[PDB]
Write an enzyme that holds these catalytic residues in place. Structure first.
Site, short mmCIF file in Angstrom:
data_model
loop_
_atom_site.label_atom_id
_atom_site.label_comp_id
_atom_site.label_asym_id
_atom_site.label_seq_id
_atom_site.Cartn_x
_atom_site.Cartn_y
_atom_site.Cartn_z
N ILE A 187 0.84 -1.19 0.00
CA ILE A 187 0.00 0.00 0.00
C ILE A 187 0.88 1.24 0.00
CG2 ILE A 187 -1.73 1.23 1.36
CD1 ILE A 187 -2.68 -1.43 0.08
N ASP A 257 -1.14 -2.44 13.61
CA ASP A 257 -0.49 -1.62 12.60
C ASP A 257 -1.49 -1.36 11.48
OD1 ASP A 257 1.68 -2.36 14.20
OD2 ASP A 257 2.91 -3.00 12.50
N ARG A 274 -0.21 -8.17 22.06
CA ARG A 274 0.90 -8.08 22.99
C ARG A 274 1.27 -6.60 22.98
NH1 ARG A 274 5.71 -8.11 19.65
NH2 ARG A 274 5.14 -8.55 17.47
N1 LIG Z 1 1.16 -4.44 2.72
C1 LIG Z 1 1.97 -3.42 3.10
N2 LIG Z 1 1.89 -2.22 2.52
C2 LIG Z 1 2.70 -1.20 2.88
N3 LIG Z 1 3.64 -1.31 3.84
C3 LIG Z 1 3.81 -2.48 4.49
C4 LIG Z 1 2.97 -3.63 4.15
N4 LIG Z 1 3.34 -4.65 4.94
C5 LIG Z 1 4.35 -4.19 5.72
N5 LIG Z 1 4.62 -2.89 5.44
C6 LIG Z 1 5.66 -2.05 6.06
O1 LIG Z 1 6.59 -2.95 6.66
C7 LIG Z 1 6.57 -2.76 8.09
C8 LIG Z 1 6.80 -4.09 8.78
O2 LIG Z 1 5.77 -5.00 8.36
P1 LIG Z 1 4.96 -5.79 9.48
O3 LIG Z 1 4.02 -6.70 8.73
O4 LIG Z 1 4.38 -4.79 10.44
O5 LIG Z 1 6.08 -6.71 10.16
P2 LIG Z 1 6.53 -6.81 11.72
O6 LIG Z 1 5.86 -8.07 12.20
O7 LIG Z 1 8.03 -6.93 11.61
O8 LIG Z 1 6.02 -5.57 12.42
C9 LIG Z 1 5.23 -2.07 8.36
O9 LIG Z 1 5.26 -1.31 9.58
C10 LIG Z 1 5.06 -1.19 7.15
O10 LIG Z 1 5.90 -0.02 7.24
MG LIG Z 2 4.45 -4.29 12.40
NA NA Z 3 2.24 -9.14 14.81
#
Ligand SMILES: Nc1ncnc2c1ncn2[C@@H]1O[C@H](COP(=O)(O)OP(=O)(O)O)[C@@H](O)[C@H]1O
Ligand SMILES: [Mg+2]
Ligand code: NA
Ligand SMILES: [Cl-]
Length: 364
Positions: A187, A257, A274
């Site tokens: 996104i 998030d 958590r």
């Molecule tokens: N589908 C997505 N679109 C845009 N940014 C993403 C997406 N998935 C992850 N991100 C970016 O990557 C970061 C880490 O991904 P996340 O799924 O939150 O992993 P973690 O479990 O390490 O927090 C997010 O905080 C965001 O900045």
């Molecule tokens: Mg995250």
């Molecule tokens: Na998580």
């Protein structure tokens, strides 16, 4: 403001240690200033005189209700002793193997904790809402399936998160992958939020506030900032997710998030049933300048004495709120890197970030 003992019954003992062992030990002190009456399992090096000194500057005390440990065996034996002989229930922040403790001594249902925190299962916890284009794919079919996706995209375990902007990124990700993977459209967010809630039976669901996540373009974590301008529909998306988890038995703190695109659509990309370091920034708001706040953590560059004394300089100036300190000198002079978790706070982003950069320059 709430403290963690407000959420957890009197028989609960808390561990925030992941199951880098030094980084895991450093995380044991993350919640000490918000624990209040909740006993916390803490590495000895996470509560030395250095922590007492930092807390004293800001008018705080190290909780007397801590249980300490000093290596893996003492950590595991302490958990068993508290559960088997002191009638405690252990509240975990990270999944621990069954040999450490049988599920019946967990404060929070282990099966539920794993399910809530399983990234593949996000659609169950959102009731199908707030999702980007996303598929869960078995590894043997991944390389062929990924050809159907436009860039930018994100690959996650079903290595960590791998954001790919182009073919070169994708080929590097495939090499690192070589049972299941999540593929998600990346996104183009205009905002992100980590929206946080608490629940206990007596309190119901409480919205705690939100922090912005600072991440580079590959998603790597660079800290969290305060925010009070959270759209109502973002808060409501988080509240709905919280209620879904609570309805199955969740209690404690959770953070979600949530990304927002240019059309104000909300995307739930990561559910964290958590807490995190930024929970303390929300719950300690009464002691922080509301102009600008940034939570992050730092490592000694080598000289732990210079690290500590530079930290103390900035704490005494009033710009830097200390949360946690892992004293590497507990192992012998400069044998292990000291680590520090904290909140920079002040009247404005410009002045606060200048202080952070001045601190980093003084360290290097
Ligand atoms: N589908 C997505 N679109 C845009 N940014 C993403 C997406 N998935 C992850 N991100 C970016 O990557 C970061 C880490 O991904 P996340 O799924 O939150 O992993 P973690 O479990 O390490 O927090 C997010 O905080 C965001 O900045
Ligand atoms: Mg995250
Ligand atoms: Na998580
Ligand atoms: Cl699961």
């Amino acid at each position: 403001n709430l403290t963690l003992s407000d959420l957890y019954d009197k028989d609960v003992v808390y561990t925030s240690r992941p199951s880098d062992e030094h980084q895991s030990n450093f995380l044991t002190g993350r919640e000490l200033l918000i624990a209040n009456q909740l006993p916390v399992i803490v590495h000895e090096a996470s509560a030395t005189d250095k922590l007492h000194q930092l807390f004293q500057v800001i008018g705080k005390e190290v909780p007397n209700s801590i249980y300490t440990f000093n290596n893996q065996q003492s950590y595991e034996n302490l958990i068993k002793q508290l559960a088997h002989k002191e009638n405690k229930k252990i509240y975990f922040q990270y999944i621990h193997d069954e040999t450490i403790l049988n599920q019946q001594y967990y404060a929070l249902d282990k099966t539920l904790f794993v399910a809530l925190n399983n990234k593949a299962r996000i659609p169950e916890w959102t009731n199908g809402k707030f999702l980007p284009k996303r598929k869960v794919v078995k590894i043997e079919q991944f390389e062929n399936e990924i050809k159907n996706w436009e860039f930018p995209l994100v690959i996650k375990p079903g290595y960590g998160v791998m954001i790919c902007y182009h073919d070169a990124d994708l080929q590097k990700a495939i090499t690192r992958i070589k049972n299941s993977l999540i593929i998600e459209q990346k996104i183009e967010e205009k905002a992100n939020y980590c929206v946080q809630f608490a629940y206990s039976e007596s309190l119901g669901i409480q919205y705690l506030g939100a922090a912005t996540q600072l991440t580079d373009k590959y998603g790597f974590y660079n800290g969290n900032e305060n925010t009070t301008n959270v759209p109502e529909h973002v808060i409501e998306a988080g509240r709905q997710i919280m209620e879904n988890g609570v309805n199955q038995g969740f209690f404690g703190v959770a953070g979600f998030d949530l990304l927002v695109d240019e059309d104000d659509n909300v995307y739930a990309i990561d559910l964290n049933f958590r807490q995190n370091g930024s929970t303390s920034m929300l719950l300690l708001a009464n002691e922080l300048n509301s102009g600008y706040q940034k939570f992050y953590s730092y490592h000694s560059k080598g000289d732990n004495t210079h690290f500590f004394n530079t930290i103390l300089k900035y704490v005494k100036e009033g710009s830097l709120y200390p949360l946690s300190y892992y004293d590497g000198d507990w192992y012998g002079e400069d044998k292990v890197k000291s680590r520090f978790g904290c909140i920079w706070h002040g009247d404005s982003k410009e002045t606060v970030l200048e202080n952070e950069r001045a601190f980093l320059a003084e360290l290097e």
